[PDB]
Amino acid sequence: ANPYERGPNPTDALLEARSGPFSVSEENVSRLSASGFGGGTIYYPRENNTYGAVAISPGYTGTEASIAWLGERIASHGFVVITIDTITTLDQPDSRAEQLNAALNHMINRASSTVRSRIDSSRLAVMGHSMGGGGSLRLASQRPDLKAAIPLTPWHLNKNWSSVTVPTLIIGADLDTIAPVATHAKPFYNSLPSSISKAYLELDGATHFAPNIPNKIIGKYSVAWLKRFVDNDTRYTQFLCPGPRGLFGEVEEYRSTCPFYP
């Protein structure tokens, strides 16, 4: 009944694997071609269909190489995904929000027909690492039409995200000393409205750079979140609700507003 379902029925194994079930191709976006961001790489399913589209930003000093693994992995579960470079590696979070917006527009309107035809432009999401995660929150606050936001070890000077209504999964890292969960991730999660679809997943034994290092937990829960909200795919609710709420060695804590009005 759900026209947006893609791919085989999921399992924990299928979601933890290095690659999902979709073969993936890439399209480079040069800095020349990009308007309002620094270029990047668009990963997309070889199999023709329409999919949701996702823009991912790196963090301060970061390049697309630091998030490439995640772009490719998410695309391999049935999404069109752009990992961007920013105008400069030192851009601040609200600038990164604008750049995420520009990157979404690029995929929808300026990429090749191969890419553009694979996107349902009504089903979009944003993600980012650190300041890029801050950027994701800012854009989500501005764009209630977005289907999902996933701030990864996010950093932002503004802690109050009570304006955000986009389904938001925040992933924190317990040992983060750059964007400590006590002063960034948790304040953000707690200020998001209680009324929205949201979750907080804190990684156990993780530094600030966990999102830059191929990680089965980040991969599994990012894909499950995008599936549930970008694709309305309730086959993925099972992974999120009740969710992994002291899987020690993997997940320090998990909070949510499950079950998200099934």
Side-chain angles (χ1 to χ4, degrees), residues 196-241:
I196 69 160
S197 297
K198 61 175 188 177
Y200 174 63
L201 189 160
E202 185 173 314
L203 300 169
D204 193 15
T207 74
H208 188 65
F209 302 99
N212 306 132
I213 301 163
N215 182 304
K216 69 178 191 62
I217 301 294
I218 293 174
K220 170 171 175 185
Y221 289 100
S222 291
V223 169
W225 195 261
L226 292 172
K227 283 285 190 177
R228 172 56 185 83
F229 295 109
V230 179
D231 294 357
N232 304 334
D233 192 340
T234 54
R235 297 178 295 171
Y236 288 81
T237 301
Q238 63 178 299
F239 308 105
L240 303 175
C241 302

mmCIF file of all heavy atoms in Angstrom, residues 196-241:
data_model
loop_
_atom_site.group_PDB
_atom_site.id
_atom_site.type_symbol
_atom_site.label_atom_id
_atom_site.label_comp_id
_atom_site.label_asym_id
_atom_site.label_seq_id
_atom_site.Cartn_x
_atom_site.Cartn_y
_atom_site.Cartn_z
ATOM 1 N N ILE A 196 7.142 15.798 18.712
ATOM 2 C CA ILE A 196 7.612 15.363 17.401
ATOM 3 C C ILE A 196 8.168 13.948 17.442
ATOM 4 O O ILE A 196 8.347 13.377 18.520
ATOM 5 C CB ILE A 196 8.693 16.329 16.803
ATOM 6 C CG1 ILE A 196 10.030 16.272 17.558
ATOM 7 C CG2 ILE A 196 8.157 17.747 16.750
ATOM 8 C CD1 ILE A 196 11.204 16.800 16.721
ATOM 9 N N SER A 197 8.428 13.381 16.268
ATOM 10 C CA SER A 197 9.160 12.132 16.177
ATOM 11 C C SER A 197 10.628 12.443 16.395
ATOM 12 O O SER A 197 11.240 13.170 15.600
ATOM 13 C CB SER A 197 8.999 11.489 14.803
ATOM 14 O OG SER A 197 7.642 11.159 14.565
ATOM 15 N N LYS A 198 11.214 11.899 17.442
ATOM 16 C CA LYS A 198 12.629 12.132 17.701
ATOM 17 C C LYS A 198 13.245 10.974 18.461
ATOM 18 O O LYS A 198 12.543 10.178 19.098
ATOM 19 C CB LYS A 198 12.842 13.455 18.459
ATOM 20 C CG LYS A 198 12.160 13.492 19.841
ATOM 21 C CD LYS A 198 12.525 14.784 20.578
ATOM 22 C CE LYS A 198 12.032 14.782 22.013
ATOM 23 N NZ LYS A 198 12.455 16.027 22.724
ATOM 24 N N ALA A 199 14.562 10.892 18.400
ATOM 25 C CA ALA A 199 15.319 9.923 19.167
ATOM 26 C C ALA A 199 16.724 10.425 19.426
ATOM 27 O O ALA A 199 17.242 11.253 18.674
ATOM 28 C CB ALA A 199 15.356 8.569 18.452
ATOM 29 N N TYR A 200 17.303 9.933 20.515
ATOM 30 C CA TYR A 200 18.673 10.221 20.895
ATOM 31 C C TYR A 200 19.365 8.890 21.077
ATOM 32 O O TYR A 200 18.926 8.060 21.876
ATOM 33 C CB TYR A 200 18.747 11.043 22.184
ATOM 34 C CG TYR A 200 20.171 11.232 22.660
ATOM 35 C CD1 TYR A 200 21.073 11.923 21.875
ATOM 36 C CD2 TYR A 200 20.622 10.696 23.861
ATOM 37 C CE1 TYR A 200 22.373 12.094 22.269
ATOM 38 C CE2 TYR A 200 21.939 10.863 24.269
ATOM 39 C CZ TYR A 200 22.804 11.573 23.463
ATOM 40 O OH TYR A 200 24.113 11.757 23.808
ATOM 41 N N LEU A 201 20.438 8.672 20.335
ATOM 42 C CA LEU A 201 21.225 7.457 20.443
ATOM 43 C C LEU A 201 22.640 7.878 20.812
ATOM 44 O O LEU A 201 23.287 8.594 20.040
ATOM 45 C CB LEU A 201 21.200 6.674 19.121
ATOM 46 C CG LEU A 201 21.819 5.263 19.184
ATOM 47 C CD1 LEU A 201 21.334 4.399 18.026
ATOM 48 C CD2 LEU A 201 23.338 5.271 19.190
ATOM 49 N N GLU A 202 23.124 7.468 21.979
ATOM 50 C CA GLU A 202 24.488 7.796 22.378
ATOM 51 C C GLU A 202 25.359 6.560 22.213
ATOM 52 O O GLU A 202 25.077 5.503 22.790
ATOM 53 C CB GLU A 202 24.524 8.304 23.815
ATOM 54 C CG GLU A 202 25.919 8.772 24.228
ATOM 55 C CD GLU A 202 25.954 9.428 25.580
ATOM 56 O OE1 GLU A 202 25.085 10.279 25.864
ATOM 57 O OE2 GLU A 202 26.861 9.089 26.384
ATOM 58 N N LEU A 203 26.400 6.686 21.401
ATOM 59 C CA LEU A 203 27.359 5.615 21.182
ATOM 60 C C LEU A 203 28.243 5.418 22.401
ATOM 61 O O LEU A 203 28.666 6.387 23.030
ATOM 62 C CB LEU A 203 28.234 5.955 19.989
ATOM 63 C CG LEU A 203 27.472 6.146 18.683
ATOM 64 C CD1 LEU A 203 28.386 6.742 17.638
ATOM 65 C CD2 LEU A 203 26.876 4.821 18.205
ATOM 66 N N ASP A 204 28.527 4.153 22.714
ATOM 67 C CA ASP A 204 29.428 3.774 23.806
ATOM 68 C C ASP A 204 30.865 3.630 23.300
ATOM 69 O O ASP A 204 31.108 2.952 22.304
ATOM 70 C CB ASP A 204 28.948 2.439 24.379
ATOM 71 C CG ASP A 204 29.597 2.097 25.699
ATOM 72 O OD1 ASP A 204 30.205 2.984 26.328
ATOM 73 O OD2 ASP A 204 29.483 0.931 26.113
ATOM 74 N N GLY A 205 31.812 4.264 23.979
ATOM 75 C CA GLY A 205 33.214 4.161 23.609
ATOM 76 C C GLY A 205 33.513 4.840 22.284
ATOM 77 O O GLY A 205 34.243 4.303 21.441
ATOM 78 N N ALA A 206 32.941 6.026 22.106
ATOM 79 C CA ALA A 206 33.028 6.756 20.835
ATOM 80 C C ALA A 206 33.560 8.161 21.031
ATOM 81 O O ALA A 206 33.143 8.870 21.942
ATOM 82 C CB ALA A 206 31.652 6.825 20.165
ATOM 83 N N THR A 207 34.482 8.558 20.154
ATOM 84 C CA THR A 207 34.961 9.924 20.111
ATOM 85 C C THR A 207 34.106 10.748 19.152
ATOM 86 O O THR A 207 33.226 10.237 18.460
ATOM 87 C CB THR A 207 36.424 10.027 19.627
ATOM 88 O OG1 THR A 207 36.492 9.800 18.210
ATOM 89 C CG2 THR A 207 37.324 9.052 20.364
ATOM 90 N N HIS A 208 34.428 12.029 19.096
ATOM 91 C CA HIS A 208 33.820 12.954 18.162
ATOM 92 C C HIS A 208 33.914 12.492 16.715
ATOM 93 O O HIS A 208 33.097 12.885 15.884
ATOM 94 C CB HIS A 208 34.527 14.285 18.276
ATOM 95 C CG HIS A 208 33.861 15.370 17.509
ATOM 96 N ND1 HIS A 208 32.599 15.833 17.813
ATOM 97 C CD2 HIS A 208 34.275 16.071 16.431
ATOM 98 C CE1 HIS A 208 32.272 16.791 16.969
ATOM 99 N NE2 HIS A 208 33.270 16.957 16.122
ATOM 100 N N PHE A 209 34.927 11.686 16.407
ATOM 101 C CA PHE A 209 35.159 11.268 15.030
ATOM 102 C C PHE A 209 34.529 9.937 14.658
ATOM 103 O O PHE A 209 34.741 9.433 13.551
ATOM 104 C CB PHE A 209 36.667 11.309 14.753
ATOM 105 C CG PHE A 209 37.243 12.666 14.990
ATOM 106 C CD1 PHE A 209 37.905 12.953 16.177
ATOM 107 C CD2 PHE A 209 37.060 13.678 14.072
ATOM 108 C CE1 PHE A 209 38.402 14.213 16.413
ATOM 109 C CE2 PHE A 209 37.552 14.944 14.309
ATOM 110 C CZ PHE A 209 38.225 15.210 15.479
ATOM 111 N N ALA A 210 33.721 9.370 15.551
ATOM 112 C CA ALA A 210 33.026 8.135 15.238
ATOM 113 C C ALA A 210 32.244 8.206 13.916
ATOM 114 O O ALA A 210 32.261 7.245 13.139
ATOM 115 C CB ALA A 210 32.126 7.712 16.393
ATOM 116 N N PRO A 211 31.576 9.338 13.627
ATOM 117 C CA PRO A 211 30.842 9.372 12.356
ATOM 118 C C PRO A 211 31.710 9.362 11.101
ATOM 119 O O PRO A 211 31.178 9.169 10.007
ATOM 120 C CB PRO A 211 30.045 10.682 12.449
ATOM 121 C CG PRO A 211 29.890 10.914 13.929
ATOM 122 C CD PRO A 211 31.236 10.503 14.473
ATOM 123 N N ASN A 212 33.011 9.555 11.259
ATOM 124 C CA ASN A 212 33.936 9.554 10.135
ATOM 125 C C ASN A 212 34.596 8.207 9.890
ATOM 126 O O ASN A 212 35.426 8.076 8.975
ATOM 127 C CB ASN A 212 35.053 10.569 10.370
ATOM 128 C CG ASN A 212 34.535 11.947 10.676
ATOM 129 O OD1 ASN A 212 34.986 12.576 11.637
ATOM 130 N ND2 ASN A 212 33.595 12.439 9.867
ATOM 131 N N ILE A 213 34.230 7.229 10.710
ATOM 132 C CA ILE A 213 34.860 5.912 10.729
ATOM 133 C C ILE A 213 33.721 4.914 10.531
ATOM 134 O O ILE A 213 32.797 4.903 11.329
ATOM 135 C CB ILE A 213 35.563 5.664 12.103
ATOM 136 C CG1 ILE A 213 36.644 6.727 12.379
ATOM 137 C CG2 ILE A 213 36.168 4.268 12.172
ATOM 138 C CD1 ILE A 213 37.083 6.806 13.836
ATOM 139 N N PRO A 214 33.777 4.074 9.474
ATOM 140 C CA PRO A 214 32.663 3.161 9.189
ATOM 141 C C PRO A 214 32.182 2.455 10.453
ATOM 142 O O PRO A 214 32.977 1.877 11.195
ATOM 143 C CB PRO A 214 33.268 2.182 8.178
ATOM 144 C CG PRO A 214 34.288 3.004 7.459
ATOM 145 C CD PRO A 214 34.866 3.939 8.490
ATOM 146 N N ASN A 215 30.881 2.529 10.700
ATOM 147 C CA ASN A 215 30.318 2.201 12.005
ATOM 148 C C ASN A 215 28.964 1.540 11.791
ATOM 149 O O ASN A 215 28.053 2.156 11.246
ATOM 150 C CB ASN A 215 30.197 3.504 12.814
ATOM 151 C CG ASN A 215 29.671 3.299 14.220
ATOM 152 O OD1 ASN A 215 28.595 2.745 14.426
ATOM 153 N ND2 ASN A 215 30.425 3.788 15.203
ATOM 154 N N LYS A 216 28.827 0.282 12.216
ATOM 155 C CA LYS A 216 27.591 -0.464 11.944
ATOM 156 C C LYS A 216 26.361 0.086 12.669
ATOM 157 O O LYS A 216 25.242 -0.037 12.175
ATOM 158 C CB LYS A 216 27.763 -1.950 12.253
ATOM 159 C CG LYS A 216 27.919 -2.288 13.710
ATOM 160 C CD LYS A 216 28.036 -3.806 13.885
ATOM 161 C CE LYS A 216 27.917 -4.220 15.344
ATOM 162 N NZ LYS A 216 26.589 -3.858 15.919
ATOM 163 N N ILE A 217 26.563 0.699 13.836
ATOM 164 C CA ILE A 217 25.458 1.273 14.597
ATOM 165 C C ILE A 217 24.952 2.554 13.925
ATOM 166 O O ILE A 217 23.755 2.737 13.710
ATOM 167 C CB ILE A 217 25.878 1.566 16.069
ATOM 168 C CG1 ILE A 217 26.327 0.267 16.753
ATOM 169 C CG2 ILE A 217 24.733 2.200 16.841
ATOM 170 C CD1 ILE A 217 25.214 -0.762 16.946
ATOM 171 N N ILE A 218 25.870 3.456 13.590
ATOM 172 C CA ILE A 218 25.472 4.651 12.865
ATOM 173 C C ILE A 218 24.779 4.258 11.546
ATOM 174 O O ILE A 218 23.735 4.811 11.190
ATOM 175 C CB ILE A 218 26.668 5.578 12.604
ATOM 176 C CG1 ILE A 218 27.203 6.153 13.937
ATOM 177 C CG2 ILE A 218 26.267 6.701 11.644
ATOM 178 C CD1 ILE A 218 28.496 6.985 13.787
ATOM 179 N N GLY A 219 25.352 3.286 10.837
ATOM 180 C CA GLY A 219 24.780 2.846 9.577
ATOM 181 C C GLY A 219 23.383 2.272 9.726
ATOM 182 O O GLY A 219 22.460 2.652 9.006
ATOM 183 N N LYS A 220 23.208 1.368 10.676
ATOM 184 C CA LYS A 220 21.912 0.732 10.895
ATOM 185 C C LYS A 220 20.825 1.734 11.270
ATOM 186 O O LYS A 220 19.746 1.743 10.671
ATOM 187 C CB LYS A 220 22.044 -0.330 11.989
ATOM 188 C CG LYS A 220 20.726 -0.890 12.486
ATOM 189 C CD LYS A 220 20.982 -2.082 13.407
ATOM 190 C CE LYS A 220 19.723 -2.604 14.031
ATOM 191 N NZ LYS A 220 20.069 -3.674 15.015
ATOM 192 N N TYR A 221 21.104 2.587 12.249
ATOM 193 C CA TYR A 221 20.073 3.479 12.752
ATOM 194 C C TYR A 221 19.810 4.670 11.833
ATOM 195 O O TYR A 221 18.676 5.117 11.714
ATOM 196 C CB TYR A 221 20.350 3.879 14.212
ATOM 197 C CG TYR A 221 20.114 2.679 15.101
ATOM 198 C CD1 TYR A 221 21.169 1.906 15.566
ATOM 199 C CD2 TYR A 221 18.825 2.270 15.404
ATOM 200 C CE1 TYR A 221 20.948 0.782 16.339
ATOM 201 C CE2 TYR A 221 18.597 1.143 16.170
ATOM 202 C CZ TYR A 221 19.660 0.415 16.635
ATOM 203 O OH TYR A 221 19.441 -0.709 17.407
ATOM 204 N N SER A 222 20.836 5.131 11.126
ATOM 205 C CA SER A 222 20.637 6.170 10.116
ATOM 206 C C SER A 222 19.731 5.652 9.004
ATOM 207 O O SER A 222 18.758 6.311 8.630
ATOM 208 C CB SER A 222 21.948 6.658 9.516
ATOM 209 O OG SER A 222 22.710 7.380 10.470
ATOM 210 N N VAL A 223 20.016 4.459 8.492
ATOM 211 C CA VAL A 223 19.175 3.890 7.444
ATOM 212 C C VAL A 223 17.760 3.629 7.950
ATOM 213 O O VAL A 223 16.814 3.955 7.279
ATOM 214 C CB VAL A 223 19.797 2.619 6.839
ATOM 215 C CG1 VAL A 223 18.792 1.893 5.948
ATOM 216 C CG2 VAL A 223 21.047 2.989 6.032
ATOM 217 N N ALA A 224 17.616 3.059 9.140
ATOM 218 C CA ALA A 224 16.280 2.793 9.669
ATOM 219 C C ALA A 224 15.461 4.085 9.838
ATOM 220 O O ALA A 224 14.266 4.121 9.543
ATOM 221 C CB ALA A 224 16.382 2.046 10.999
ATOM 222 N N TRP A 225 16.120 5.144 10.303
ATOM 223 C CA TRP A 225 15.450 6.425 10.484
ATOM 224 C C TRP A 225 14.998 7.004 9.129
ATOM 225 O O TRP A 225 13.859 7.432 8.975
ATOM 226 C CB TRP A 225 16.369 7.405 11.213
ATOM 227 C CG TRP A 225 15.655 8.594 11.748
ATOM 228 C CD1 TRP A 225 15.571 9.835 11.190
ATOM 229 C CD2 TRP A 225 14.904 8.645 12.959
ATOM 230 N NE1 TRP A 225 14.798 10.661 11.989
ATOM 231 C CE2 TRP A 225 14.382 9.950 13.085
ATOM 232 C CE3 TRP A 225 14.633 7.707 13.958
ATOM 233 C CZ2 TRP A 225 13.589 10.339 14.170
ATOM 234 C CZ3 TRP A 225 13.864 8.091 15.038
ATOM 235 C CH2 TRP A 225 13.346 9.398 15.142
ATOM 236 N N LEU A 226 15.898 7.029 8.156
ATOM 237 C CA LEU A 226 15.568 7.529 6.825
ATOM 238 C C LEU A 226 14.443 6.711 6.181
ATOM 239 O O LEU A 226 13.508 7.251 5.580
ATOM 240 C CB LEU A 226 16.818 7.517 5.943
ATOM 241 C CG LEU A 226 17.905 8.514 6.343
ATOM 242 C CD1 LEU A 226 19.152 8.243 5.502
ATOM 243 C CD2 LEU A 226 17.467 9.973 6.199
ATOM 244 N N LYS A 227 14.529 5.400 6.308
ATOM 245 C CA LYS A 227 13.477 4.529 5.803
ATOM 246 C C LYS A 227 12.121 4.866 6.427
ATOM 247 O O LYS A 227 11.130 5.061 5.720
ATOM 248 C CB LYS A 227 13.818 3.066 6.074
ATOM 249 C CG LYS A 227 14.849 2.495 5.131
ATOM 250 C CD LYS A 227 14.290 2.195 3.750
ATOM 251 C CE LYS A 227 15.296 1.413 2.921
ATOM 252 N NZ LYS A 227 14.732 1.042 1.589
ATOM 253 N N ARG A 228 12.071 4.924 7.754
ATOM 254 C CA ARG A 228 10.801 5.158 8.423
ATOM 255 C C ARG A 228 10.200 6.504 8.018
ATOM 256 O O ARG A 228 9.001 6.614 7.824
ATOM 257 C CB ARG A 228 10.988 5.108 9.947
ATOM 258 C CG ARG A 228 9.767 5.521 10.761
ATOM 259 C CD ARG A 228 8.515 4.706 10.411
ATOM 260 N NE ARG A 228 7.350 5.216 11.140
ATOM 261 C CZ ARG A 228 6.598 6.247 10.758
ATOM 262 N NH1 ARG A 228 6.834 6.907 9.637
ATOM 263 N NH2 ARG A 228 5.565 6.626 11.513
ATOM 264 N N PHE A 229 11.037 7.538 7.903
ATOM 265 C CA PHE A 229 10.514 8.889 7.729
ATOM 266 C C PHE A 229 10.562 9.442 6.311
ATOM 267 O O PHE A 229 9.612 10.098 5.888
ATOM 268 C CB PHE A 229 11.154 9.817 8.767
ATOM 269 C CG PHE A 229 10.770 9.449 10.169
ATOM 270 C CD1 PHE A 229 11.681 8.883 11.033
ATOM 271 C CD2 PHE A 229 9.460 9.620 10.589
ATOM 272 C CE1 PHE A 229 11.272 8.523 12.317
ATOM 273 C CE2 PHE A 229 9.057 9.259 11.853
ATOM 274 C CZ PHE A 229 9.947 8.702 12.707
ATOM 275 N N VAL A 230 11.625 9.169 5.564
ATOM 276 C CA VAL A 230 11.679 9.599 4.172
ATOM 277 C C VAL A 230 10.764 8.727 3.308
ATOM 278 O O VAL A 230 10.129 9.239 2.388
ATOM 279 C CB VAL A 230 13.126 9.592 3.625
ATOM 280 C CG1 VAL A 230 13.163 10.007 2.170
ATOM 281 C CG2 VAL A 230 14.023 10.508 4.456
ATOM 282 N N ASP A 231 10.692 7.429 3.598
ATOM 283 C CA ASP A 231 9.906 6.490 2.800
ATOM 284 C C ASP A 231 8.589 6.092 3.483
ATOM 285 O O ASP A 231 7.837 5.290 2.940
ATOM 286 C CB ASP A 231 10.684 5.195 2.513
ATOM 287 C CG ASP A 231 11.907 5.390 1.633
ATOM 288 O OD1 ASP A 231 12.189 6.511 1.165
ATOM 289 O OD2 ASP A 231 12.602 4.381 1.445
ATOM 290 N N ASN A 232 8.317 6.624 4.678
ATOM 291 C CA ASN A 232 7.157 6.211 5.478
ATOM 292 C C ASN A 232 7.118 4.700 5.699
ATOM 293 O O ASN A 232 6.049 4.108 5.828
ATOM 294 C CB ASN A 232 5.848 6.660 4.830
ATOM 295 C CG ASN A 232 5.790 8.152 4.586
ATOM 296 O OD1 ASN A 232 6.449 8.939 5.277
ATOM 297 N ND2 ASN A 232 4.990 8.554 3.604
ATOM 298 N N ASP A 233 8.284 4.075 5.758
ATOM 299 C CA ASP A 233 8.381 2.624 5.655
ATOM 300 C C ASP A 233 8.316 1.996 7.028
ATOM 301 O O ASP A 233 9.304 1.951 7.775
ATOM 302 C CB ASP A 233 9.671 2.243 4.932
ATOM 303 C CG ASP A 233 9.717 0.784 4.533
ATOM 304 O OD1 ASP A 233 8.967 -0.046 5.108
ATOM 305 O OD2 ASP A 233 10.518 0.462 3.639
ATOM 306 N N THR A 234 7.131 1.514 7.370
ATOM 307 C CA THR A 234 6.920 1.010 8.714
ATOM 308 C C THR A 234 7.517 -0.384 8.919
ATOM 309 O O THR A 234 7.453 -0.921 10.015
ATOM 310 C CB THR A 234 5.441 1.049 9.074
ATOM 311 O OG1 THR A 234 4.699 0.359 8.072
ATOM 312 C CG2 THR A 234 4.963 2.494 9.159
ATOM 313 N N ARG A 235 8.126 -0.968 7.887
ATOM 314 C CA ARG A 235 8.932 -2.164 8.079
ATOM 315 C C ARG A 235 10.161 -1.868 8.950
ATOM 316 O O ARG A 235 10.789 -2.790 9.464
ATOM 317 C CB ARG A 235 9.388 -2.745 6.739
ATOM 318 C CG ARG A 235 8.263 -3.226 5.825
ATOM 319 C CD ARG A 235 8.817 -3.739 4.509
ATOM 320 N NE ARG A 235 9.440 -2.659 3.745
ATOM 321 C CZ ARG A 235 10.161 -2.838 2.644
ATOM 322 N NH1 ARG A 235 10.369 -4.068 2.165
ATOM 323 N NH2 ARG A 235 10.664 -1.791 2.017
ATOM 324 N N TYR A 236 10.498 -0.586 9.126
ATOM 325 C CA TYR A 236 11.706 -0.208 9.858
ATOM 326 C C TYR A 236 11.413 0.245 11.298
ATOM 327 O O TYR A 236 12.334 0.408 12.091
ATOM 328 C CB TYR A 236 12.521 0.829 9.061
ATOM 329 C CG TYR A 236 13.187 0.178 7.856
ATOM 330 C CD1 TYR A 236 12.481 -0.061 6.679
ATOM 331 C CD2 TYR A 236 14.506 -0.241 7.923
ATOM 332 C CE1 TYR A 236 13.088 -0.698 5.592
ATOM 333 C CE2 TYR A 236 15.115 -0.867 6.858
ATOM 334 C CZ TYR A 236 14.406 -1.081 5.686
ATOM 335 O OH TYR A 236 15.058 -1.695 4.644
ATOM 336 N N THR A 237 10.139 0.418 11.632
ATOM 337 C CA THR A 237 9.757 0.787 12.989
ATOM 338 C C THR A 237 10.346 -0.199 13.997
ATOM 339 O O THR A 237 10.788 0.196 15.082
ATOM 340 C CB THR A 237 8.215 0.830 13.108
ATOM 341 O OG1 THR A 237 7.699 1.786 12.172
ATOM 342 C CG2 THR A 237 7.761 1.178 14.531
ATOM 343 N N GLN A 238 10.381 -1.476 13.624
ATOM 344 C CA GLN A 238 10.858 -2.523 14.524
ATOM 345 C C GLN A 238 12.272 -2.286 15.066
ATOM 346 O O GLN A 238 12.587 -2.740 16.163
ATOM 347 C CB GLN A 238 10.807 -3.890 13.819
ATOM 348 C CG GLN A 238 11.713 -3.976 12.601
ATOM 349 C CD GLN A 238 11.699 -5.335 11.932
ATOM 350 O OE1 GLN A 238 12.059 -6.343 12.540
ATOM 351 N NE2 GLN A 238 11.299 -5.366 10.666
ATOM 352 N N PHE A 239 13.130 -1.610 14.301
ATOM 353 C CA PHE A 239 14.501 -1.342 14.736
ATOM 354 C C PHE A 239 14.597 -0.124 15.645
ATOM 355 O O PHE A 239 15.521 -0.018 16.452
ATOM 356 C CB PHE A 239 15.403 -1.158 13.518
ATOM 357 C CG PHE A 239 15.294 -2.290 12.549
ATOM 358 C CD1 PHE A 239 14.599 -2.139 11.365
ATOM 359 C CD2 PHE A 239 15.842 -3.526 12.859
ATOM 360 C CE1 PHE A 239 14.475 -3.200 10.476
ATOM 361 C CE2 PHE A 239 15.719 -4.596 11.984
ATOM 362 C CZ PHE A 239 15.038 -4.436 10.796
ATOM 363 N N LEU A 240 13.641 0.782 15.485
ATOM 364 C CA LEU A 240 13.655 2.045 16.222
ATOM 365 C C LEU A 240 12.873 1.985 17.537
ATOM 366 O O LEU A 240 13.147 2.763 18.454
ATOM 367 C CB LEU A 240 13.044 3.141 15.358
ATOM 368 C CG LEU A 240 13.723 3.366 13.995
ATOM 369 C CD1 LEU A 240 12.940 4.389 13.183
ATOM 370 C CD2 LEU A 240 15.157 3.799 14.188
ATOM 371 N N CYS A 241 11.892 1.087 17.614
ATOM 372 C CA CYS A 241 10.944 1.069 18.725
ATOM 373 C C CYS A 241 10.694 -0.369 19.152
ATOM 374 O O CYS A 241 10.166 -1.147 18.365
ATOM 375 C CB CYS A 241 9.621 1.689 18.297
ATOM 376 S SG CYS A 241 9.800 3.398 17.702
#
